[PDB]
Structure 1
Amino acid sequence: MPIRIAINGTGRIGLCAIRVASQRKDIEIVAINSTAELETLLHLIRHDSVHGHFEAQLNADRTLNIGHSKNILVLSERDINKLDFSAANAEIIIECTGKFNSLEASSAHLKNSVKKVIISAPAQNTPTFVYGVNHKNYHNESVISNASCTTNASAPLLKILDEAFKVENALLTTIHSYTNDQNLLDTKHKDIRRARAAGLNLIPTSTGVSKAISLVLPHLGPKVTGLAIRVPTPNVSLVDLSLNFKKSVSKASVQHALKDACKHAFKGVVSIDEERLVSSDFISSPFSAIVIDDQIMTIGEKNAKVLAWYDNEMGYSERLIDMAQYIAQN
């Protein structure tokens, strides 16, 4: 029988996760919890200003029908203690609200049938896994973190380039689309930079790169750091790695080491663009990272710059469900 999952929270990642899971034959969405009215949640699933239209229907009994999940229960309960996925016999939760990004909080989902919780974000005191990077070290933990979108795109490249060349140090900048933690106009915010209109401004913003890499590539954590700059695009982001290696490198050798890993250890996770595309071309791309082959450069013997695209919504949502598949069986 398909793996029975429930989606908690229907903002950006919630909506993407639904749409991704709906296209996986080996998955069944049995429930969704949404603070949106039912009709609104349907509307939002169907119609996206960035990703386009999607086929979704309502059954007479007021369940949703989307691709291979034909009987989705819809719930609307903010309080996690009253929320009961058991009712639909959910095995695994993808937690997408942003309000329970900790081990303590998200454990509350574990009840009758519910045995596993994947958090759509970094999470306090929470074992953290990134498909293709350290996911094979999964050992039946009941509550995990799928990390940030930026780690899913950065950690692969770091692994690959470390295994090929040994990373001594690296600096990361992510040029990131604006997300719902930002403001439409200049108003109150706990961060006085993200207070400012997202669509008008370049907005530097601190992001815990060292800590993130520590969880999934511990030997590299103390050697890598960086930051983010939020920019006026609605989706699709760009990671910019500046790396110092132990072994000498060239444009050619870095290119080769990346292409090779896309054929082997990172098939379906990392890709290469040779066609000189731009951000909008990666809307809805399933990859954790698409390397920008023609812009790879080196300087001196040991240093290189590597760029890669990632759809911070869909790429990550693909990985969410990939990981659901993976931990349902292992």
Structure 2
Amino acid sequence: VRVAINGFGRIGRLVMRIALSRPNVEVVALNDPFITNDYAAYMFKYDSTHGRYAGEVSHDDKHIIVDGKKIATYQERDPANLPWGSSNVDIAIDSTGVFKELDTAQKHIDAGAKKVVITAPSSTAPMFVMGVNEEKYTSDLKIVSNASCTTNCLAPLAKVINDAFGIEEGLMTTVHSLTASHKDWRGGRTASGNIIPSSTGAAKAVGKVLPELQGKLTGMAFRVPTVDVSVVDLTVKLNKETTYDEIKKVVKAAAEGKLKGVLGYTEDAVVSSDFLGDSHSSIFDASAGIQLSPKFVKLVSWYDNEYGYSTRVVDLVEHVAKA
């Protein structure tokens, strides 16, 4: 599968790290009009939380070069101008966050890509979360969205819980790290010393990938100045009586079976930085959860804000291509 990345921000760069390691994905090109090749190579090589790239990174006038692989670079403000057809690009991965609707991401198909994966929620493109609704994807869909990182954490867990005990209602909190203000006053305050309440649309987004949960979840976030690992805190009313031991067994079974690699499970005394670089969408913290009564429980799940999501992007890219 031949892929091109639009945008060299954190997501674009981690998607490239992951895709370079994928045996059946080949990174052909990168587009970003706001950076130079030497700055691209520098940003790809060094990462404050995911470490130096384990490999040789360099550049020339027309490429970024990684372990001898030459990746062509472009600086087109308008993606319709990109030589995707000329380069035989199968999937265009758009991580800019600005071509995230059907009419805008269409520019990549116009440029000659066969399909587009948007690494951000979309109001018009169908959203897919691996482990949740990827079997609903049909090969005639040419433009798809991978939803958000918080949605990717919450949705696989909410599906497991709802399938086994039934979710009647749920309220969610996410303790959310900085990495990713007339419109949002709290968020314009200094990150450094502050807990900063925020709204988040993840609990509603779950209603779009799990329609049976539509209208059953809402929540908010507390932003804090920590490494880019976040944690969801899901307080749910259940349909069926259960015990926490049974919740643990069901989640662990899903993590070891059908949701392997997407949903993780731990009983260790972890803290947020223990999940830097974790490729799971969601890591259930069995020891942090707490049940009060047979149908009332608090579930805790971790996620690396960028890395699990980027791994899912490449997962979706491969899935959409095999179709």
TM-score, length basis structure 1:
0.93
Amino acid at match of 1:289: S
Shift of 1:301: 1.8
**1:128 to 2:145 alignment:** no
Deviation at 1:200, TM superposition (A): 2.2
Give the stretch that moved more between structures: 253-262 or 105-114: 105-114
Contact 2:155 2:206 in 1 (8 A): yes
Q: CA RMSD in A?
A: 1.6
2:184 paired residue number? 191
SS of equivalent to 2:317:
helix
User: % of aligned pairs identical?
Assistant: 40
In 2, are the aligned partners of 1:56 and 1:64 still within 8 Å (CA)?
A: no
- In structure 2, the residue matched to 1:142 is 142
Matched residue SS, 1:175: strand
Once the two structures are superposed, the pairs formed by residues 213-252 of structure 1 within 5 Å of their partners are: 213-252=206-245
| Structure 2 counterpart of 1:324 | 317
Counterpart position of 1:85: 84
Is 1:166 the counterpart of 2:166? The answer is yes
**Counterpart in the other structure of 1:211:** 204
How far did 1:211 drift? 3.2
1:277-316 counterparts in 2 under 5 A? 277-316=270-309
Is the 8 Å Cα contact of residues 249 and 298 (structure 1) preserved in structure 2? no
Bigger mean CA deviation after superposition, 263-272 or 225-234: 225-234
Change (3 A) 1:83 1:234: farther
Unaligned runs of 5+ in 1: 181-187
For structure 1, which segment, 57-66 or 16-25, has the greater mean C-alpha deviation from structure 2 after superposition? Answer: 57-66
The residue aligned with 2:26 is 28
| Preserved contact between residue 228 and residue 305 of structure 2 (Cα < 8 Å) | yes
d(CA) in 2 for partners of 1:13 and 1:112? 22
* Matching residue of 1:95: 94
Flag as ranges the 4+ runs of structure 1 deviating above 6 A. Answer: none
1: CA distance between counterparts of 2:171 and 2:224? 19
Partner of 1:183: none
Specify the alignment match of 1:10 in structure 2.
8
Deviation at 1:229, TM superposition (A): 1.6
Q: How far did 1:60 drift?
A: 5.9
CA contact (8 A) 2:38 2:59 kept: no
Is 1:157 matched up with 2:157? Answer: yes
The 1-side partners of 2:83 and 2:197 are apart by 40
Q: Does 1:65 align with 2:58?
A: no
Amino acid at match of 2:49: V
Q: Aligned letter for 1:200? A: G
What SS does the aligned partner of 1:53 have? coil
* 8 Å contact kept, 1:173–1:241: yes
Aligned partner (choices 189, 196, 201) of residue 194 of structure 2: 201
Q: Structure 2 CA distance, aligned partners of 1:38 and 1:63? A: 7
- The offset of 1:26, in angstroms, is 0.7
Q: Aligned partners of 1:324, 1:66: CA distance in 2, in Å?
A: 21
- The count of aligned residue pairs is 320
Counterparts of 1:38 and 1:31 in 2: how far apart (Å)?
12
Amino acid at match of 1:265: K
Is there any run of 5+ residues in structure 2 with no aligned partner, and where?
A: none
2:56 and 2:249 map into 1 onto residues whose CA distance is 42
Q: Contact conserved, 1:255 with 1:296, CA < 8 A, in 2?
A: no
Give CA-to-partner distance per residue, 1:41-72, whole Å, 9 cap, x none. 000100111111012433667423335x8231
Q: Which amino acid aligns with 1:170?
A: G
3-state SS of the aligned residue for 1:159? helix
Asked if the contact 2:172–2:203 (Cα under 8 Å) also holds between the matched residues in 1, the reply is no
Whole-angstrom CA distance in 2 between matches of 1:64 and 1:222:
46
